[model samples]
Target: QTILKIGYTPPKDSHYGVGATTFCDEVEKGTQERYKCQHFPSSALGGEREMIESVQLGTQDLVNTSTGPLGNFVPETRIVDIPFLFRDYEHARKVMDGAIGQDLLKKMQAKGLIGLAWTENGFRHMTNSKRPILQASDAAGLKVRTMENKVHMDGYKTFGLLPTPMAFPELFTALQQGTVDGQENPIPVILSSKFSQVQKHLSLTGHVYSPAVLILSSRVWDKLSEADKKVFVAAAQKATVAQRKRVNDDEANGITQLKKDGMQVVEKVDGESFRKAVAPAYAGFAKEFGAERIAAIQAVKAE
Candidate 1:
């Protein structure tokens, strides 16, 4: 049996954890024990940046990573980094599984990265140790640690928040030490990362629809037979379905759970107000990503 390292950045109880484990399970079983995956969770190997390069250099076999970090490596993926580009999970998933998403994945191959399948990081929300985020003005002057992405920083600036870029493993401690007043993530991620212990306010910003990629090392990818490739492909596809279910379940239940854990859950956030507030950033975004590329993503309806 060939053992491959499966790197991730969350605890075993989190969605990333489950997705990695599930994909490994399906691959080993589908191939009838010809392959096995070893788990490296909580940035055990390193954060997403190092992990991405490690896979490209063939030092790591596979990783479950969000588009936030990949855009840094593969510029073509920066298109998805546009603020408020996706209407909802349904819209984002359809576009990703469609031609536009496929073509972008092909572009990723140029960077020596292989995208096995598009799962999700879900819609990102905001949580702070300060006050609740009812309107855009509430975020003004607050120091928020956003992903180290240009587009993400621009979006936060438009909302009037001070953006501090940080890594995955460092976020909780940064919040605890008051290095940042707030941070944003999906509700399940917030719960799983245990950010509730350091932060008191949870706001459903949904500012960005984050999609996670199950990335394989093309070096390892080229070594697979046609049959073995299908086994891995099928493994990723099955993992996609299961991961979305985990996210959907979390989306529906995470808010209630956050409140139960002593968080001030702000349920009704005004999307219109946010849209208007971030409108200024759209012009630059369109120019950066091209009008046609941005248009293609918007053209996708949630059917």
Candidate 2:
């Protein structure tokens, strides 16, 4: 039997982890045990960047990582992480499921990776111990932990916050230990990581819409039969839909739970002010990724 190894950074309860487990189950059922899949979660293997590199080097077979880390390899992905660039979930979905998504998958092929599908990370919300971040100035003097990405770092800098780029494995402890003043992630992640326990304020900034990309190592992908490849792709797509629904449902309930747990949920935030403050990041990132590609993505109409 052929064994496939999948690496994921989030704990088993996270949405990405949920989708990865579901995909494994479906693949096992579809293949009827002819193929065996093993999962490594919570960075048991390594952080997202490390796992991505492992996939490229053939040391690992598959990984589901947030686009933030993938952006380091394929700079064009930075567009997706631009703060407040997506109008809403529908707008983001349209871009990912359309031509832009195909373009990104093709980019991955050149980097020795196979992009199978895009999973939802939902919108990022700010969590802090000091106070709710309602405006750009509110973040001033607060040290925020961001994904190790230039776009995210620059975007946070625009708000006057000292942005520290750190790997996911160290984020929760940093917040709990007061190494960083605040951090942002989707509600599902915050709840799964138990960040709400250490963070007293939850601001629904939705500053960025992060998406997880499911990738397979080219070394392993090339070995699969065409039939198996089709099966894997179909399974990933199905799991993506289910994972997105899980994230949405979790966010809705997570907010209520945070309030019950004595965390302040700031419902209304000046997203536009934050967007305008970070507009320069778009231009800077566009220059790095090419203006035409950036325009093509921005021009996509919401479905």
Candidate 3:
């Protein structure tokens, strides 16, 4: 039996952990205990970018990461990071599970990576130590920590805030030392990272549907038997269900817990104003990723 090393940035109890562990369990079961995974939670190996590089270089076995840094390797994935591109969770999932997402997965092969399946990071929200943000103007001037993604920074710039690009491993210290006034992440992330201790305000911006993926190195993929390859795909699919369900659970119950933990919650932010604020960024997005492609994603129907 061969043990694979799987790494993710979030704590073991977070959605990343939920998905990775579920995938590991299924792979072991499907392969008749021939394969098991050793966990490296909380960026034990390295941050997302470093981990992805390691996987690409075939030094790491697998990584469960968001598209935050994947765009550097697979440029097509960046289009999904555009602000407010997806209407809702259902809308986002349908688009990712459909042809558009499958094609993106195919794009990974040329880059020497294997895209096992599309998972999720849920929708990102805003949190800060400054104050409650009820409208677009309220977010102005706060230095918010964002991923090292140009698309996200460009969209965030239209909101009039300073988007500080930082690695995930350094973010907690940055927030604690007042280096950044705030950061944006999904409820599951904020709760798992215990950002409530440092961040006082929480806004339900849902600015972007940050999708995650279960990535395998091509070195590992090329060596697998055809039957084993099918097992891995099936394992990732089952893992996606558990991962998404955890996101749903966190979205449902996380806010109340954050409030109870002393975060001042703003349940209803002016969504329209935020949307309008970032609308101009779409022009650049269209110019870069094609207007028709962006429209196709928006054209996805979800109730």
Candidate 4:
């Protein structure tokens, strides 16, 4: 049996971890053990960008990563990071499963990646050690850690925070050392990573809907049998479903755990303020990606 190595940066209990485990299980079992999916968690391979680059160069076989570090590889994916571009999970999911999303995946093939299916990081929220983020201005002057995604960095700047690009593996420690004042992620990630211990304030900013992709080395993909290729796609779809379910469950229940662990929870934020702050940055986003592409995403309707 052929063994495929997949890399992702997160704890074994995280959404990315579950997805990799599910993918490994599905491919190995669904194909009757003809192949094996090996997962390297905690960035045993490297961070998101390095992992994707490794896959591209055939040094790695698979990577389940967010478009966070992928924009530099495949420019089209930067659209996913547009602040507040996705109305909700339903809209974002539907758009990714539609033509536009397929088109973006096609864009990746030219970059040596075979994008299988869309997964998610869910809506990101704000958390800080300095103070609770009550309004848009409250975020100003705080040092916030952001994904390397340009749009995300710009979005944080629009909100008035001093944005720093940091790796996922280093984020908790940075916050602990006061190297950064706040960082944003979904409730599931915040709780699963046990961020409440180092960070004291939690704000449900729900600012951006960060999406992940399951990317395989085009070299490995091209050599797969037709039947095995079908199996791979089907397995990716199954893993996506299970991964999203786990994230949803955690989003619902994890906040309680954060509170139990002694974190200050701010349940509501003025979306309008944040939205207003982001209004100007859209022009730059438009120039970088496209006004029409941004509009296309904004037009996606939720079920």
Give the per-residue lDDT of model 3 (tens digit) for 1-303: 788999999999999999999999999988888788999999999999999999999999999999999999998899999999999999999998999988888998789879999998989999999889998899999999999899999999889889999989999999999999999999989989999989999999899989999999999899888998999999998888999999999989998999899999998999999899999988899999999999999998843
Q: What Cα-based lDDT does every candidate model obtain?
A: 0.87, 0.85, 0.93, 0.87
Q: Which candidate comes out best when scored by TM-score?
A: 3
Residue 276's C-alpha lDDT in candidate 1?
89
Q: State residue 132's C-alpha deviation in candidate 2, in Å.
A: 1.7
Task: For each candidate, give its TM-score against the true structure.
Answer: 0.97, 0.95, 0.98, 0.96
- Look at candidate 2 and give me any clashing residue pairs: none
Q: Residue 267 in candidate 2 has what lDDT? A: 93
Off by over 4 Å in 1: none
lDDT of 2 by residue, 231-271 (tens): 88878888788889889888879899888889998899888
RMSD of 4: 1.3
Candidate 3 stretches with Cα past 4 Å from truth are: none
Can you tell me which runs of candidate 4 are displaced by over 4 Å?
none
> Measured by C-alpha RMSD in angstroms, how accurate is candidate 1?
1.2
Q: Write candidate 1's Cα lDDT for 4-101 as tens digits.
A: 99887777777887788888999999889988998898899988888998999998999999887788888778788777899988899998889988
Model 2: weakest 10-residue lDDT segment is 294-303
| Candidate 4 lDDT tens digits, 187-296 | 76787788898999999888888888889998899888999888888888887888888889888888888899999999988889999999999888899888998888
Kindly give the number of clashing pairs for every candidate: 0, 0, 0, 0
Mind sharing the TM-score for model 3?
Answer: 0.98
Error of 1 at 5 (Å): 0.6
- What ranking emerges by lDDT with the best candidate at the front? 3, 4, 1, 2
**Local error of candidate 2 at 230, Å?**
0.8
